[PDB]
Design a protein around this ligand. Structure first.
Ligand SMILES: *P(=O)(O)OC[C@H]1O[C@@H](n2cnc3c(N)ncnc32)[C@H](O)[C@@H]1O
Length: 256
DNA sequence: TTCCGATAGTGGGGTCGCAAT
DNA sequence: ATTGCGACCC
DNA sequence: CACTATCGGAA
């Protein structure tokens, strides 16, 4: 019923009281909105799911994360986005981990309660609800994040209990993810496109372990002019690695 | 005063699907 | 059968 | 997804 989607703000952007938030593990899946009749992605591309996958689901609008287990994103994205054309029974171990309803004028605590009500009244086990728990100190958050990360999880999500749904980013829905640093030697330059015409678009870097990947973001516009010369070393941040061990969401930090 | 939230516009890894080879 | 490319997910 | 680079209004 609400127009735009409520996006999640990064943690560092100290001041919040965690006790006022529902905490839940961020599931590295595919976002999907349940139309009551149809599933659709973040940008409203139809998801071609089997009829049994949605059989007996509620007749309401629900936002959820199509998810199997931790560290199964690439495979999950292969099942969900592919057209369905009983072969293509790959949805067997997929679930719809609902986490919110886009209802206007009601606290997330109430929407969560409604979600749990809809699950008990739904015979299909594909319809699930993300587990919501409570933390106290910021230290408790840091330790839980570490544990989840080491256990293969992607991160944590914080949703304010007494907050109403509203599009955009705010402290009502916060996103928590870990990241590490690493070094790599630049092997080549790649010309940028669009506004970065005649400028550096990305760098073919390589890690000491022999993993090569293109580092294409994090540079200021001045850094793109006269970029790190080939043969030098650069430090980049990343959020884990892919199936092929390549850094994910990598961005440039500083040289040396 | 600073800082936040919203846009516009680049870039990656991975995958799917269609056009070109 | 191969390859390249745009458009999506993240 | 990550990011840089603006900009007007909220804090
Ligand atoms: P980006 O991932 O930066 O924005 C957040 C998205 O993550 C999805 N998501 C996955 N798992 C969860 C939970 N447990 N709670 C809330 N959101 C989650 C959302 O679909 C966002 O699009």
């Amino acid at each position: 019923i609400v127009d735009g989607l409520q996006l999640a703000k990064q943690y560092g952007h100290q001041d919040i009281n965690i006790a006022e938030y529902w905490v839940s593990e961020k599931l590295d899946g595919i976002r999907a909105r349940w139309d009551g009749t149809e599933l659709r992605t973040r940008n409203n591309n139809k998801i071609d799911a089997p009829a049994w996958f949605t059989a007996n689901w509620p007749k309401a609008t629900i936002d959820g994360e199509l998810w199997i287990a931790r560290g199964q994103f690439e495979r999950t994205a292969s099942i969900v986005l592919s057209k369905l054309t009983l072969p293509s029974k790959r949805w067997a171990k997929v679930r719809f981990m609902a986490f919110d309803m886009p209802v206007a004028g009601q606290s997330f605590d109430s929407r969560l309660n409604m979600l749990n009500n809809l699950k008990e009244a739904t015979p299909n086990p594909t319809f699930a609800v993300v587990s919501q728990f409570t933390l106290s100190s910021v230290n408790a958050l840091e330790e839980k994040l570490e544990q989840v990360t080491l256990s293969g999880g992607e991160g944590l999500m914080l949703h304010h209990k007494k907050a109403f749904y509203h599009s955009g980013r705010s402290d009502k829905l916060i996103k928590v993810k870990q990241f590490e640093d690493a070094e790599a030697k630049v092997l080549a330059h790649f010309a940028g496109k669009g506004k970065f015409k005649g400028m550096m678009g990305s760098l073919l870097v390589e890690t000491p372990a022999g993993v090569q990947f293109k580092l294409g973001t994090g540079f200021s516009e001045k850094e793109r002019r006269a970029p790190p010369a080939v043969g030098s070393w650069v430090t980049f941040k990343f959020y884990g690695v892919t199936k092929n061990g390549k850094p994910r969401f990598a961005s440039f930090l500083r040289v040396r």
